[PDB]
Design a protein around this ligand. Sequence first.
Ligand SMILES: NC(=O)c1ccc[n+]([C@@H]2O[C@H](COP(=O)([O-])OP(=O)(O)OC[C@H]3O[C@@H](n4cnc5c(N)ncnc54)[C@H](OP(=O)(O)O)[C@@H]3O)[C@@H](O)[C@H]2O)c1
Ligand SMILES: [Cl-]
Ligand SMILES: [Cl-]
Lengths: 355, 351
Amino acid sequence: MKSNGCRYGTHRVIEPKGVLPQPAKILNNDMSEIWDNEMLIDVIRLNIDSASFHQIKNKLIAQGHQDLEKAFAEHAIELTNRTGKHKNEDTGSGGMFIGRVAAIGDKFEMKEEVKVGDKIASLVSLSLTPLKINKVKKVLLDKDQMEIEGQAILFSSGVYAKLPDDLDENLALSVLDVAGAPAQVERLVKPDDTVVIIGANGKSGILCNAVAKERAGICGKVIGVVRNENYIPTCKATGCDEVILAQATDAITIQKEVSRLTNGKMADVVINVVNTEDTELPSIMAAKDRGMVYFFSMATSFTKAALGAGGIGYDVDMMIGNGYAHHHSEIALDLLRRNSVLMKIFKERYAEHHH
Amino acid sequence: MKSNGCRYGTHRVIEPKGVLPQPAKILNNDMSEIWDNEMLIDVIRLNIDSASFHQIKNKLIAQGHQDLEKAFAEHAIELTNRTGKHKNEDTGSGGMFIGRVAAIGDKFEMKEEVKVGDKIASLVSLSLTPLKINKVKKVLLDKDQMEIEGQAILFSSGVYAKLPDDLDENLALSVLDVAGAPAQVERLVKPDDTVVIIGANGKSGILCNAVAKERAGICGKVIGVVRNENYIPTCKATGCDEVILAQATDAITIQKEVSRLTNGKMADVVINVVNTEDTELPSIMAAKDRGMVYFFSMATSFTKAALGAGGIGYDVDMMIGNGYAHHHSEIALDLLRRNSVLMKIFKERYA
Ligand SMILES: NC(=O)c1ccc[n+]([C@@H]2O[C@H](COP(=O)([O-])OP(=O)(O)OC[C@H]3O[C@@H](n4cnc5c(N)ncnc54)[C@H](OP(=O)(O)O)[C@@H]3O)[C@@H](O)[C@H]2O)c1
Ligand SMILES: [Cl-]
Ligand SMILES: [Cl-]
């Protein structure tokens, strides 16, 4: 194993030469030998980023491909062979994965105690991970996941977690992919706050609904936004006091409905968890003056948010959703254990149980 | 005056019929009749964004033509008369306009007090501004300016300011262009904070250096980051206690040098104002734990920031720098009037 390993894994970077793995366009996908403080994982399953999966899927369809599950599998193997990593070349987003530890480097900065063989989750993005895909066993088009056989590198700077034993690996894969959303909502929402959750039926949305109502309290107000009337009971069961039916791209409808529901006061906090483009301005226009707009979505464009707010004279704080926060995996899992409505939904949507 | 006017400009949106003036491709430029909540202005000069004027030029050179200034005019007439606005259809950008108020709507949400015939600067992009161009008088290459004889609409949600009576027109516009940056930094910097300003030598950077030192005060520490050793005196003159020499795209150098100047404590606040790509992680890696990173540059990539920080286990807050903040014009003009060193550099650079 090579000796002088950058904990950020600059030694894997190929192009351009002076940037770190995530902004890098091409990384080193050679698992023949690892560096001194890397880590090798035999990859079970990829959870591609929802904003990315949705963009690739719509790309393959516009390209006219016949068997999406095959077209997607080819899309993965091709891009990972050419770039070294599954980073979407149009959105910049990645995803995460679960696997079994193959090789711990001599100087790997062991955080959580894991030995060779343990089954862990890479909570850092696929947008920075050197990944080799040998075969794609299965594409799950409606769950953003891919069973594969392959290997990936964890740098000593990366975030990882030994899988909980109380849940199945696929439910754990799903909750951990968005564990940063409820952790951040816990910090943003104060008692008596009005919170608007745009994309409230989604995977991170239903966790944010619940945490938002816990934090805002009996006299706070949680408002979900969805475009399918069938989602309304789930949004209310997971925390929403009110639900607006609107396209997340519809700024004028969302602003009028939030205004009506709040006597013109609008929202202290807006949480954006959709996976499509052009929802920046609708998110901004739901916020009270000097309110907080937290963009968790990887379909967010920095330019549409910045110029969207400025163009209409909105002075609101606009945050870039950080998928990492300290203890987020513990905080997310604790939310599931405390909330059985949420645990039931997650198992039904993302786990593979029997009866 | 047409009633039921939308403060956001939707009533002047033609294509697509579901989004706001900014992302829309087609706008209505009929200045024959304005809405009750609008302001008609007589545009004197069009100040196209550098990257847009450095695209209409580098496209017309290919098809030949003549003069280049004579071809930019033709392009703008066609774009504004068809699209309804001067938003580039490739870079998606547009600068600002100066001119004189011609009509004030009855129910218009007046911000700064102006009258008919006052000379205003628009603080929203041309990318959302209904614009009609009757004739171009001159096209100022390399300065990105366009004298015209046209009119433009500001919506009740627009932002504008009257030109100062006590500062050069070009000096004031140059500072109005970046006024959102020092206004927002004075909210983020607390007393005794370590602040790192990446791009400390630029136009918005020296404004941020000064605000950062004022707010952080005698026992705080302001650290500039520049690529060129000739920039150190300017940074110090405008507030940096220290300057780091490094390429903005070099996270590992910047991180080691900030650890050096701070005994490994790093920055409570990192301010990024370089207009160059791949500077997200270099900005993040200068922050201490649970520190704040402010991205003001349009070169920022949302996913590079979000997935940069999460990818390395950095629990820092990251903010999209708004080009607008309440009273930002007055806040930046007052910063210039209070700070003579800053004022002199500005007049020397942009007047
Ligand atoms: N910051 C990070 O590190 C990080 C990590 C993971 C995820 N993310 C981002 O967070 C977002 C949510 O992730 P997720 O796993 O929760 O995704 P998800 O399960 O697919 O949820 C997306 C939700 O958005 C809704 N939606 C999308 N477009 C809409 C529109 N135009 N109008 C109304 N609703 C719309 C969808 O409802 P429909 O059924 O109506 O489409 C769905 O409920 C994604 O953008 C993802 O990229 C970021
Ligand atoms: Cl612009
Ligand atoms: Cl404090």
